[model samples]
Target: KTENLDFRLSFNKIKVTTDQNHFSGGTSIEQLKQWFGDPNKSEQRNAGNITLDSYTWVKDGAVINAQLYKNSTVARSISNFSFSREAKIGKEDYDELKIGESYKKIVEKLGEPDVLSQSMSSDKEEMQTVWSSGIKTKSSSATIELYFENGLLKNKTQKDLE
Candidate 1:
């Protein structure tokens, strides 16, 4: 079974359960707009023949962002990381998230995060990006982290949620 964020699914094969809506990636822009209403900001850019569009929503005690490719498919989505709390990720009202989620996807879903630090590997061939955020916990602090390598998600962790 595959497990994370209070969920357990058989990993023997992909499962497209109703819970799939709780995750981001591979979702269309129209679907996002339909779910979140409208974005607070929208930006577009063109690099050579490639076009990039991004939308941001800053509200509901958190911020969410979405970046779309030329085909209008979300390329990256991010939102302010949250633990055991309601936070929108892209169009999803509650995103527990997962590993292997791309950095842009994370940014598109969560918006600009609190980047903790960034550095290059010893060989200078890869870049490491670390982002973190905290929510007040009853006893201490709750922390959410996203680590990226060369703009792709490498790992993520949450601590002290109680």
Candidate 2:
């Protein structure tokens, strides 16, 4: 699918390439259905003013997720995919994550994240990335998301990293 935000499913991975930092306007959900077919899993949830549609497609062991906001005029939200297994990320690893650390350095530091995702523009002006996992504990696990810009850590968000 090609738009200001394009979703390209390559041989080994799915790439979301766009010119904008966030989805101010995006490809329509119907078009996405045409491009990706029916999602393996889907749900509708309300977040304040917008009703969000969360769709998941597991293609070849990769969990591809797309979010669409029903109230948004453009119908676009956020998309991410992960070809991963159970993760080992810990709270300390997230705490030590620095914004300028390169991709190579982070893999070494974090011990290979369960999810490695990215989005980029054509001209190299901006690039966004993701390193995510369900961090393991003795009894349960929670999700952690780390995003990087230009192959360096730029955004970090975590939940239940304990």
Candidate 3:
């Protein structure tokens, strides 16, 4: 049946870089629409000479948010994107991880991450994963963040992980 609308994991598939916010893997704005369909919300605005388009999609209680640059010479491309969800593991669980670990290995211990993000460029590729030790609710959720390059953990940090 085609009735099932699956997008919760779509956030995981988004490829982007944190710096420069440039969309990697050559994923264009139109490519995103092809995968997730039109964003539930979208808006366009200009700041000085630069124009930006912001788009957001929510599915299965998860958020897939993206920002794109607009120019007549080229098609719209994502400049930044992030995926967030109710955390499954607590910040205290971060100790189970170590720097230099692989993402797939870490996932095996921490379960699925509450937040997943990445950045890629001609010269650099970086990734960040976050876990929440607290429960998700109306208030802020503290998170533990892990940064990786080329799929190996390079750094880790935790903040507001109450």
Candidate 4:
């Protein structure tokens, strides 16, 4: 939805370039294939009412994954060591997220997450929720995790899943 975002496909990588804080939302599977060629691997999972398809390309210490809905529209595109180094949520960048944003607003900005997990806080009085996007990597993992408490976003962190 954001503008001036473009990607260039290379032999073993796809480089995402942005101008003026663009986000890579609304990309289609056909467009993906056209740009990156067919995925080296693909998988699918059912999350609540929708089926999500994940397509990945792995090459020489790097991976690029695109998570799509059953309708073949992209939900999120993730990369590790493949030239992507930004956080995106729908048409907005992650830097724009504000503490205490509603869960509905989170969903509106990020779409349905690739993974949603629920947990009990140490106090056990409030529930904690987490939404994550990205794939596992060999040395570590690169992913964006959003934390919610009482139905509003409380914090967010990006780390290598070690």
Question: Model 2: residues >4 Å from true position, as ranges?
Answer: 1-87, 125-134
State the lDDT of candidate 3 residue by residue for 111-134, as single tens digits: 665566554444666666666533
Q: Each model's C-alpha lDDT?
A: 0.44, 0.52, 0.58, 0.49
Q: By lDDT, highest first, what's the ranking?
A: 3, 2, 4, 1
lDDT digits (tens) for residues 64-138 of candidate 1: 555555424333333443334333332121135665667667666665444233322223212233233323444
Instruction: After the best TM-score superposition of candidate 3, give how far the Cα of residue 14 lies from its true spot, in angstroms.
Output: 3.1
| For model 2, the run of ten residues with the poorest summed lDDT | 2-11
Compared with the true structure, model 4 gives a TM-score of 0.37
RMSD of each: 12.9, 9.6, 7.3, 13.1
List runs of model 1 lying over 4 Å from the truth: 1-25, 85-139, 142-162
Which residue segments of model 3 deviate by more than 4 Å?
1-6, 15-31, 40-55, 58-62, 66-93, 133-142, 159-162
| Model 3 poorest 10 in a row by lDDT | 71-80
Question: Per-candidate TM vs. native?
Answer: 0.41, 0.43, 0.54, 0.37
Worst 10 residues of 1 by lDDT: 7-16
Q: Compared with the true structure, what per-residue lDDT tens digits does model 2 show for residues 1-162?
A: 222122323312333434344544544456556676887888887768756666666554455565554422222223344334455666787788787878678777665444444433433423333444445554443655666666677777766665
